[PDB]
Amino acid sequence: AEIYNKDGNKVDLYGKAVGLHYFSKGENSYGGNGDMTYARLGFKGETQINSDLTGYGQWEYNFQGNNSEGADAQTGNKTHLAFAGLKYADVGSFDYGRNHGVVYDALGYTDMLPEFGGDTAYSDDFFVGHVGGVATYRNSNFFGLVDGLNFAVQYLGKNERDTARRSNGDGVGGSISYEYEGFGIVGAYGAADRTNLQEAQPLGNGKKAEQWATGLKYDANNIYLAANYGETRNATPITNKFTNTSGFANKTQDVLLVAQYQFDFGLRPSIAYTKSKAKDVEGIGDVDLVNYFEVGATYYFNKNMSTYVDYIINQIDSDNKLGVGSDDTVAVGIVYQF
Amino acid sequence: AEIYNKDGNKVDLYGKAVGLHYFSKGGENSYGGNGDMTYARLGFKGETQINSDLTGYGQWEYNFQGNNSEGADAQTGNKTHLAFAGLKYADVGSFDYGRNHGVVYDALGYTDMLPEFGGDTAYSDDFFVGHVGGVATYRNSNFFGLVDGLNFAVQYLGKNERDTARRSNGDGVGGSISYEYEGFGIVGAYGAADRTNLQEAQPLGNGKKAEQWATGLKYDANNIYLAANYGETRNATPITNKFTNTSGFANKTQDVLLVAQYQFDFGLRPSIAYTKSKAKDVEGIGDVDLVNYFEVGATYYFNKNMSTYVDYIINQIDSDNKLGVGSDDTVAVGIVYQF
Amino acid sequence: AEIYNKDGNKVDLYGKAVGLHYFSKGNSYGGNGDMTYARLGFKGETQINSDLTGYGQWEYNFQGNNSEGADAQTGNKTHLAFAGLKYADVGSFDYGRNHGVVYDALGYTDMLPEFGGDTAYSDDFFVGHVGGVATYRNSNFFGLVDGLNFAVQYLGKNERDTARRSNGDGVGGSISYEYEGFGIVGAYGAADRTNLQEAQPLGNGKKAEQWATGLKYDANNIYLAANYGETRNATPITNKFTNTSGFANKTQDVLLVAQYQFDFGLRPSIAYTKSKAKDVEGIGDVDLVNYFEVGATYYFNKNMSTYVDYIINQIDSDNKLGVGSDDTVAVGIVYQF
Ligand SMILES: [Zn+2]
Ligand SMILES: [Zn+2]
Ligand SMILES: [Zn+2]
């Protein structure tokens, strides 16, 4: 909601209140079971310094509502985004802070399900999700010459945290996308040195991490069809549920398909398929991290209100070598936003 | 404060900064405690008119404690009080899901009107008496627009297997019925739920299910506010033995609250109250008083945005209480800006 | 940003998104790596009557340099939270978490692009942000002397867990006078130290003491300021070799700041800061802070800025207290509203 536009500065305070419940049998399911209510709050501020130069800054927080008021009140509360930047004319834009990864610009094609989906976009995982300390140069329409040809280059700074799961080293990434008449093809790739703490993990053996992904999309006439393929090297985090041993998969092969139609009255049904297969797992060989079919629909009452149901037909085997949940999960959500 | 109203959507960003200090003897053996109690609140109450009959809404609220340092204890007492979204359709009623006030609190709200303290039986994360996560609530006003002033609600409570028994709950259902005429209000609320296994394993109280019910009377007109609550709980009210360092639920509680207030036209509003919560058949102590005091307080409203208040509690708890409940008085002084 | 102003109430929702990186060794002054953070708060004030006004201000810090795991809340805090009243020329009174009265003096030299104001530690009696302070503030001395401002502040005892964040009952004050672009200030405060504070190995006293003075020229796009102050049993000190925490018995604080504001936007800054601790037990006379500062800020407008802040660190490689001896340079790109 645009609350302020005086004297050349625009501030957009926005938020969502998401009443959400997960339904599953009883721990060994896709998403879990119980209350999943959360709220969001953030601002998108932007100042016109002159007709060519734009200054901007964005922050977004997540307040989980499925916690008590004692001890565990702060569980799951994060800062998803926090960055500030400058955009100049047809040259492009530069921002620094906590932002999406340059590979997520590729993975964004298939991340369009009512609640689940886009399972390959792990947070604090190099270039596929949110990540702290990224300097991003972005260019749209290639210096204002070729409409629809957008690219970005992104440098990633080392984060030596106290856990291997959420740490990273110095690295670089980039994305290229061209769109014409509602079509879209994208290519994104990035690499970084694994931190010394990550190297000591039992799972995954390497000196450098790699993520790349490509995408196809048709977005026109109330029809959305999207496909993503990508591979990771020593990047995707994995955890042996049996031994509670964590690390990184040496190689993953990721496929995502999404099919949605948008009706005029508001209902938007969704079918999707996602499979994430890890290879060369230490003492396991190949094991499926993600594998399911999706059937769900989103009803938009308007721009401000929506409800949905998202049913995951989990395809993971009961004897999965890594302890991955095999049960189905269905989510019921009612979302107010401004 | 309504910050946004356009394209059939209204947003009301609200907040308050409450300068608060507790004065007590010492004060671990007092009613409320002692020292700085400054805190801040923030939230939004959004509402969109989908059509002339259907309305969507949502509300969120957070608490930022101001009596903490910038060290390890930075977020000590930071909570999200409310978080839900819902739909209201003509005279059929309203439905929301999220974290909301419990259906028994709708009865408990009659005497929960002291300048600082009060409403002691409305524990947070305690089934139907207070703020609780994962509640689906249906509300009907004026009984489908037929009987103006006759409101009822039904509420489903999902199981929350949390790490502590104090904050856990199982599947439960509750309801409330109230009637209002010319500023008179009578209400009855009740709810029952299955206790979790971790709750059962705790000492103090043996129960298949927890039960909370309460009744309320109030007069709210001509600058006069009178109110009364009576209620009983079964395996619901959390309790702690200070000597033993053991905790659990009281098998039976009996709760009475009385409030008398006059609103002077120039802003001052004095408050007298009485509160007593007795725990019956406590495992290893039998009958023991949880809360017992008299209240004397006054709030001065400068306007709708600024106010100050003093709240003194005449603690009626004997020093020899079996559970170790505080015996000393507590007085609270507050200066509040809000919007 | 004035978010709301109807029927005599004004609310100002404000915030900042600060992209920030520290460049160092890899034992430095400021550190090394991502320092991105966000700020959010409101400054609401209502005109209750013609002569009396009510107000309240809050502010939080959301760190951006953390992950989304266990360390998500690392560095999240409430800086300010208070409410108060202001009556005509009588003055103002507010209670909550606010600035200490010694910071009003320390504010003269706390004006660098990123660092500086080392003496204004958080939760440190009267010298920085502190919780549970009742402050009476009078401007222009009941409207008699233009530019003569003073304040008195009562600090409540805070039985905080650790001695680093604890304090006892105490009183403080500040007096300032300004004339034709010049300004002089004096602030002092004393408080009863906590018993847990007294048990700590470094520092010994029945009460903590802080005072500071300041003079500055702030006109014609020039800013020169100087602060001198001394503390007794108030400044927290820590030995890295021994992992032992306490309070310096005596400190001597000097801060110098020199800036010029170019009309076109650039605003360079040079500064000098030295904090010497006297007779710390086991080490005697040691310094806590010592450096020269070279920095510039570029203000595109009121809402956007970028800066570079380079610290020449004077602390030697063999410092007895283990204070960092490496240099730190900060690069920041700041949007605010
Ligand atoms: Zn995120
Ligand atoms: Zn609550
Ligand atoms: Zn602070």
Q: Quick one: tokens of B286?
A: 């039998």
How far is A195 from A164, CA to CA, in rounded Å? 8
Are the C-beta atoms of C242 and C200 separated by less than 8 Å?
A: no
Phi, psi values for residue C194, rounded to 5°: -75, 150
Are the C-beta atoms of B275 and B291 separated by less than 8 Å?
A: yes
How far is B37 from C81, CA to CA, in rounded Å? 11
Inter-chain Cβ pairs, chain A and chain C, closer than 8 A: 145
E strand intervals along chain B:
2-5, 9-24, 35-36, 39-49, 54-65, 79-89, 93-101, 131-140, 150-157, 172-181, 184-194, 209-221, 224-234, 238-241, 246-249, 252-262, 268-282, 286-301, 306-315, 330-338
SS3 B195: coil
Q: After which residues is chain C broken (C to N over 2.5 A)?
A: 26
Among candidate residues A176, A171, A180, the one with its CA nearest the CA of residue A206: A171
Distance from CA of B254 to the nearest CA of A (A): 25
Q: How many CB atoms lie within 10 A of CB C104?
A: 26
How far is A162 from A178, CA to CA, in rounded Å? 40
SS3 C278: strand
Burial environment of residue A277 by CB neighbours within 10 A (0 to 12, 13 to 18, 19 or more):
middle
Taking the CA of B77 as reference, the closest ligand is 2
How far is A155 from A136, CA to CA, in rounded Å? 6
CA distance to A32, B310, C50, C87, per residue, from B336 (Å): 42, 12, 20, 16
Among candidate residues C114, C137, C196, C128, the one with its CA nearest the CA of residue C161: C196
In a mutational test of the C interface, the residue from B10, B16, B38 whose CB has the highest number of chain C CBs within 10 Å is: B38
Among candidate residues B92, B326, B333, B127, the one with its CA nearest the CA of residue B214: B127
Q: Which helix (H) or strand (E) holds A21?
A: strand A9-23
Burial environment of residue A239 by CB neighbours within 10 A (0 to 12, 13 to 18, 19 or more):
middle
Are the C-beta atoms of B294 and B314 separated by less than 8 Å?
A: yes
Task: Provide the H-helix boundaries in chain A.
Answer: 104-107, 141-145, 196-199
| Sign of the dihedral defined by the CA atoms of residues B295, B300, B304, B306, in that order | negative
Q: Quick one: tokens of C225?
A: 């300021």
Amino acid identity of residue B244, one-letter, is T
Q: How many CA atoms lie within 13 A of C233 on its CB side?
A: 23
Question: Residues with Cβ < 8 Å from A21, sequence gap 6 or more?
Answer: A34, A35, A36, A331, A332, A333, B97, B134, B158
Distance from CA of C35 to the nearest CA of A (A): 8
Residue of C nearest to B64 (CA): C78
Among candidate residues B43, C95, B42, C334, the one with its CA nearest the CA of residue A336: B43
How far is A311 from A289, CA to CA, in rounded Å? 18
Q: Which residues of A184-216 are buried (b: 16+ CB within 10 A; e: fewer)?
A: bebbbbbbbbbbeebbebebbeeeebbbbbbbb
| Sign of the dihedral defined by the CA atoms of residues A154, A160, A164, A165, in that order | negative
How far is C118 from C257, CA to CA, in rounded Å? 13
Burial environment of residue C280 by CB neighbours within 10 A (0 to 12, 13 to 18, 19 or more):
buried
In a mutational test of the B interface, the residue from A64, A334, A335, A337 whose CB has the highest number of chain B CBs within 10 Å is: A334
How far is C124 from C106, CA to CA, in rounded Å? 13
CB contact under 8 A, B69 and C156: no
Q: How many CB atoms lie within 10 A of CB A135?
A: 19
How far is B22 from B115, CA to CA, in rounded Å? 13
| Sign of the dihedral defined by the CA atoms of residues B249, B250, B254, B259, in that order | negative
Q: Token pair 């939080």 is at which residue?
A: C60
B1: which chain C residues are within 8 Å (Cβ-Cβ)?
3-4, 6, 9, 11
Q: Quick one: tokens of B129?
A: 């008496």
**Which residues are paired to A173 by β-bridges?**
A154, A190
Cα B99 to ligand 2 centre (Å)? 9
CB contact under 8 A, B17 and C82: yes
Q: Token pair 């020329």 is at which residue?
A: C89
Q: Quick one: tokens of C96?
A: 């909550």
How far is A155 from A10, CA to CA, in rounded Å? 28
Among candidate residues B42, B6, B48, the one with its CA nearest the CA of residue A1: B6
Are the C-beta atoms of A122 and A104 separated by less than 8 Å?
A: no
Residue of A nearest to C62 (CA): A79
CB contact under 8 A, C94 and B19: yes
How far is B113 from A40, CA to CA, in rounded Å? 31
How far is C62 from A74, CA to CA, in rounded Å? 13
Task: Provide the H-helix boundaries in A53-177.
Answer: 104-107, 141-145
Taking the CA of C165 as reference, the closest ligand is 3
Question: Residues with Cβ < 8 Å from B197, sequence gap 6 or more?
Answer: none
Give A237's DSSP letter. E
Are the C-beta atoms of B329 and B313 separated by less than 8 Å?
A: yes
How far is B212 from B1, CA to CA, in rounded Å? 35
In a mutational test of the A interface, the residue from C23, C77, C333 whose CB has the highest number of chain A CBs within 10 Å is: C333
A165: which chain C residues are within 8 Å (Cβ-Cβ)?
69
C21: which chain A residues are within 8 Å (Cβ-Cβ)?
96, 133, 157
**Which residues are paired to B282 by β-bridges?**
B286
Question: Residues with Cβ < 8 Å from C136, sequence gap 6 or more?
Answer: C91, C92, C93, C151, C152, C153
Which chains reach chain A with 3 or more Cβ–Cβ distances below 8 angstroms?
B, C
Q: How many CB atoms lie within 10 A of CB C52?
A: 14
B301: which chain C residues are within 8 Å (Cβ-Cβ)?
none
Q: Which residues of B162-200 are buried (b: 16+ CB within 10 A; e: fewer)?
A: bebbbbbbbebebbbbbebeeeebebbbbbbbbbbeebe
Q: How many CB atoms lie within 10 A of CB A43?
A: 23
Are the C-beta atoms of A299 and A267 separated by less than 8 Å?
A: yes
Compute the CA torsion angle A93, A99, A105, A109 (nearest 10 deg): -130
CB contact under 8 A, A15 and B160: no
Taking the CA of A98 as reference, the closest ligand is 1
Are the C-beta atoms of B123 and B320 separated by less than 8 Å?
A: no
Question: Residues with Cβ < 8 Å from A162, sequence gap 6 or more?
Answer: A197, C71
Residue of B nearest to A36 (CA): B134
Resolution (A): 3.1
How far is C126 from B293, CA to CA, in rounded Å? 38
How far is A119 from A213, CA to CA, in rounded Å? 13
Are the C-beta atoms of C228 and C274 separated by less than 8 Å?
A: no
Distance from CA of C129 to the nearest CA of B (A): 9
* CA angle in degrees (0–180, nearest 5) for C129-C132-C138: 75
In a mutational test of the B interface, the residue from C7, C59, C63, C82 whose CB has the highest number of chain B CBs within 10 Å is: C82
| Sign of the dihedral defined by the CA atoms of residues C105, C111, C112, C114, in that order | positive
Q: Which residues of B104-143 are buried (b: 16+ CB within 10 A; e: fewer)?
A: bbbbbbbbbbbbbbbbbbbbbbbbbbbbbbbbbbbbbbeb
Amino acid identity of residue A201, one-letter, is Q
Phi, psi values for residue C195, rounded to 5°: -60, -45
Taking the CA of A128 as reference, the closest ligand is 1
Taking the CA of B69 as reference, the closest ligand is 3
How far is C41 from B70, CA to CA, in rounded Å? 17
Amino acid identity of residue C129, one-letter, is H
Are the C-beta atoms of B278 and B287 separated by less than 8 Å?
A: yes
Are the C-beta atoms of C230 and C248 separated by less than 8 Å?
A: no
CB contact under 8 A, B83 and A65: yes
**Which residues are paired to C191 by β-bridges?**
C170, C208
In a mutational test of the C interface, the residue from A38, A83, A246 whose CB has the highest number of chain C CBs within 10 Å is: A83
Q: How many CB atoms lie within 10 A of CB C127?
A: 31
How far is C145 from A15, CA to CA, in rounded Å? 48
Question: Residues with Cβ < 8 Å from C259, sequence gap 6 or more?
Answer: C111, C222, C223, C224, C267, C268, C269, C270
Question: Residues with Cβ < 8 Å from C190, sequence gap 6 or more?
Answer: C170, C171, C172, C207, C208, C209, C210
Are the C-beta atoms of A72 and C5 separated by less than 8 Å?
A: no
Which chains reach chain C with 3 or more Cβ–Cβ distances below 8 angstroms?
A, B
Among candidate residues A160, A271, A14, B16, the one with its CA nearest the CA of residue C65: A160
Burial environment of residue C180 by CB neighbours within 10 A (0 to 12, 13 to 18, 19 or more):
exposed
Residue of B nearest to A21 (CA): B134
How far is B29 from C7, CA to CA, in rounded Å? 45
C33: which chain A residues are within 8 Å (Cβ-Cβ)?
133, 157-160
Considering CB atoms only, which of B38, B73, B337 is closest to C132?
Answer: B38
Q: How many CA atoms lie within 13 A of C291 on its CB side?
A: 27
How far is A15 from B43, CA to CA, in rounded Å? 10
How far is A212 from A235, CA to CA, in rounded Å? 11
Q: Token pair 């509640």 is at which residue?
A: B135
Amino acid identity of residue B195, one-letter, is R
Q: Quick one: tokens of A60?
A: 């977004």
Inter-chain Cβ pairs, chain A and chain B, closer than 8 A: 147
Q: Which residues of C12-40 are buried (b: 16+ CB within 10 A; e: fewer)?
A: bbbbbbbbbbbebeebbbbebbbbbbbbb
Taking the CA of C97 as reference, the closest ligand is 3
B contact set with C (CB within 8 A)? 1-3, 13, 15-19, 21, 35-36, 38-40, 42, 64-75, 302-306, 335-339
Q: How many CA atoms lie within 13 A of A327 on its CB side?
A: 13
Give C70's DSSP letter. G
CB contact under 8 A, B163 and A71: yes
Question: Residues with Cβ < 8 Å from C78, sequence gap 6 or more?
Answer: B40, B64, B65, B66, B68, B74, C58, C59, C60, C61, C97
* CA angle in degrees (0–180, nearest 5) for A61-A62-A65: 145
Are the C-beta atoms of C163 and C193 separated by less than 8 Å?
A: no
C333: which chain A residues are within 8 Å (Cβ-Cβ)?
84-86, 95-96
SS3 B167: helix
SS3 B197: helix
Q: Token pair 């509420």 is at which residue?
A: B155
Amino acid identity of residue C333, one-letter, is I
Distance from CA of A30 to the nearest CA of B (A): 19
Question: Residues with Cβ < 8 Å from A230, sequence gap 6 or more?
Answer: A103, A106, A107, A120, A211, A212, A213, A214, A254
CA distance to A185, B15, B115, B161, C302, per residue, from A60 (Å): 29, 19, 35, 29, 22
Q: How many CA atoms lie within 13 A of A239 on its CB side?
A: 6
Method: X-ray
Q: Quick one: tokens of A106?
A: 């590729």
Q: How far out from the chain centre does Cα C50 lie?
A: 33
Are the C-beta atoms of A185 and A169 separated by less than 8 Å?
A: no
Distance from CA of B64 to the nearest CA of C (A): 7
Q: Token pair 């008179």 is at which residue?
A: B184
Q: Quick one: tokens of B176?
A: 């409330």
Residue of C nearest to A43 (CA): C15
Strands B150-157 and A53-64: unpaired
How far is A132 from C245, CA to CA, in rounded Å? 32
Ion ligand 1 residue ranges (Cβ < 5 Å): A 80, 123, 130
How far is C26 from C195, CA to CA, in rounded Å? 39
CB contact under 8 A, B70 and C122: yes
Q: Which helix (H) or strand (E) holds B71?
A: none
Q: Give C169-211 as a DSSP string.
A: SEEEEEEEEEETTEEEEEEEEEEPPPHHHHHSSB---SSEEEE
